[PDB]
Amino acid sequence: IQFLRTDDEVVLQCTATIHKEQQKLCLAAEGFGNRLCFLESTSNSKNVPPDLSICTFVLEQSLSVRALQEMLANGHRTLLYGHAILLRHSYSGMYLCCLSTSRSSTDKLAFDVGLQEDTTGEACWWTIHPASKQRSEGEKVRVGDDLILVSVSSERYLHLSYGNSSWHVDAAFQQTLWSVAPISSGSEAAQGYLIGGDVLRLLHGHMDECLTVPSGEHGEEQRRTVHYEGGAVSVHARSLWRLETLRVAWSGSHIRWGQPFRLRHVTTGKYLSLMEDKNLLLMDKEKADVKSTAFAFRSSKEKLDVGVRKEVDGMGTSEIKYGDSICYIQHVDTGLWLTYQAVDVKSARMGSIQRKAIMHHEGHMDDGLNLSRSQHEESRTARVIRSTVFLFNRFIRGLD
Amino acid sequence: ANVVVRLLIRRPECFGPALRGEGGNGLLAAMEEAIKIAEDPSRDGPDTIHMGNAIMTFYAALIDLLGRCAPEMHLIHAGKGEAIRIRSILRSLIPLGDLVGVISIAFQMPEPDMSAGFCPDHKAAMVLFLDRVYGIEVQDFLLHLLEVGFLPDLRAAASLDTAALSX
Structure with a gap:
């Protein structure tokens, strides 16, 4: 029932069913030293702990795609379906954005996702959509809702690509589950x-x-x-x-x-x-x-x-x-x-x-x-x- | 045009498997193998449907559709952002070197032979896609393209006296 109001610390997880076994993989970004994102396994935490410090993102702005384009061509809010959000990495302080280079040769059309310092441009904004028919646009998002993020720049889906060692998330055209786990609600x-x-x-x-x-x-x-x-x-x-x-x-x-x-x-x-x-x-x-x-x-x-x-x-x-x-x-x-x-x-x-x-x-x-x-x-x-x-x-x- | 690109990227399987997939590379090898299918009769009806020609026409039609789906003649593309977005989508989805290699095949010039193979109208779609998506303002690019993919076809067209086979 809890809503996701702005200026809060959140964690972006997904569920992967590969090799007839289920795993829970998070979105992580080292920040210093490299720009691209990688995966942290919150599952199998009994012997190998996940680095939750670098898996935390904070939502700065939650505006409509249209207000966003007005600002581009130029306050604790509440998140609404169909808006575009700005995910600032908690540790590094940079912003999640859609890159222009590709490292995974298995996808000749997909783009990589990483961090950038500047907020200018449509790459750093991600529009948010529900993953179920019971929820439509203009609805408030509760905790644990099935969310999915699309790049404003490339209109590409936050896809969880699979590789033998190339376990990356890229900007592809196939959808993937993305759940938001709260960390700090931004309250007092x-x-x-x-x-x-x-x-x-x-x-x-x-x-x-x-x-x-x-x-x-x-x-x-x-x-x-x-x-x-x-x-x-x-x-x-x-x-x-x-x-x-x-x-x-x-x-x-x-x-x-x-x-x-x-x-x-x-x-x-x-x-x-x-x-x-x-x-x-x-x-x-x-x-x-x-x-x-x-x-x-x-x-x-x-x-x-x-x-x-x-x-x-x-x-x-x-x-x-x-x-x-x-x-x-x-x-x-x-x-x-x-x-x-x-x-x-x-x-x-x-x-x-x-x-x-x-x-x-x-x-x-x-x-x-x-x-x-x-x-x-x-x-x-x-x-x-x-x-x-x-x-x-x-x-x-x-x-x- | 915009909704067509949106739908085609939402369902990527509409594109040919040699372009789109984790399998085939792209138009270069696709049309090399298409020429192979047209040449080899082990791959057809033993007036039959030439599978190589069918693949060639499908890919040419897709390229022509994408080219005519390109945002504009750069009237609104200069000041628009959605047009630049669509054009970048098209560029990143169809490699330029693939198109150059497809254009540079230099089909034969033929007593008559059959037109159920690599027809000259196939490169028209590639030319339209290049003109509407990538364009020509670069000197060495234009010269290289003319040297590699244009001069042999021009010579083939010009070396005609009486055997007017293909208008």
């Missing part, structure tokens, strides 16, 4: 409260430390280790974490106590994982199990409630603060809690002050996790750092 996002999908970090009341990893001077095997550090690390790229919620709809709602979600290191792109033979470490996305990498925050020390909350469909209740919100990390499998250690022996106590994190039942009654959100500027800086180090390492290996 309560300032100072934690919101799903944020990039933030943790501090202590009387220690001024952060949960971080060793810097780049060591190898990434050594960086896989996790510890606490203070000083200049308080504001750095490697001292930031992202709360990736399992749900693909309303993922950018108010996070509440007890719900599960993974912690992602923005600099390395890896998630916090636990095997009982060792302590928590960082590992890549190809094996990120839900039970291994899911965590939660509790407001006390007891185990009074674990399986109390199942699902809330909406913005949710604004509960968790940033400053005065003492949270306690709790793993979904073992129920172990954070502890600071004293691994640095007295022989090297005056040197590098790092106190490792061991996740244990008892803990210490002095943790005091105070949350602090990182601004969009340095969150973007950290993730673009990750992208560029990945690309440069690939180039270095390829040339070497």
Whole structure:
């Protein structure tokens, strides 16, 4: 019943039935480094998580095709069928548009879809149409409606082309399902409260430390280790974490106590994982199990409630603060809690002050996790750092 | 014209399979194989329907329809946006080099033979499509087209004394 009003974060998914099996594939755009779009698999999220950060789009304007052409030849709205929308990528800030070049040789007439900075032209606008007879033009669009987008410039359909490795979406003439999953409704996002999908970090009341990893001077095997550090690390790229919620709809709602979600290191792109033979470490996305990498925050020390909350469909209740919100990390499998250690022996106590994190039942009654959100500027800086180090390492290996 | 292009792009199977599909490349190989069908009697009724000629006429009719469906003589195309959109659609859907190769076939000039093959009127549709969709303002393009696809046919037409077979 909820309408899609402008200035909201949405996710564009589709369903593909290939090789007699059904998959749910999203629309994703890396943004920095390349322009073309690709596919993120929200399905099969039990071991390989989808990168929801780069799959989010915001609708800027919702005007008629005709008002659009008047503007070309020259306010929270509500989306209507038959209008033309402007989909700005949430992270990169560019706009979804129909390109002029083609990479998939299987389609000699189709055009590719990507991102462009400028809003000028008809390429960046996509007219919206229903996919059912019960809905006609001029109707308000509800959540979960079957939508389909046509390029204003080329009048080509947002088709999901198939390839052996050429799994692209192109501007073809054959229709494909496209569903919109809300993330943030654009309503009053309560300032100072934690919101799903944020990039933030943790501090202590009387220690001024952060949960971080060793810097780049060591190898990434050594960086896989996790510890606490203070000083200049308080504001750095490697001292930031992202709360990736399992749900693909309303993922950018108010996070509440007890719900599960993974912690992602923005600099390395890896998630916090636990095997009982060792302590928590960082590992890549190809094996990120839900039970291994899911965590939660509790407001006390007891185990009074674990399986109390199942699902809330909406913005949710604004509960968790940033400053005065003492949270306690709790793993979904073992129920172990954070502890600071004293691994640095007295022989090297005056040197590098790092106190490792061991996740244990008892803990210490002095943790005091105070949350602090990182601004969009340095969150973007950290993730673009990750992208560029990945690309440069690939180039270095390829040339070497 | 606009609604015709809209419907033809909504149903892409109206175009020939050698043009449209993930299979055949386009008009070049399509008409090479069409010449092969016309030459080889294993592919016909053993006055019969020459399948190669039928394919050639179908493709020529499609090209002529698209050319006459081109937006305009650039009266309204200069200031219109929908006309530019339709013209770009036509350009991107029919490659130019394919049309050049189709024009440059240089059919034979014949005692009489049969006109149930590559008729000279087939290239008329290609010429109309080029004139109405792509046009000629470029010097080296015009010279190259004249050298490759026009001079042999002009010589064939001019080398006539008495055997007036094809007007």
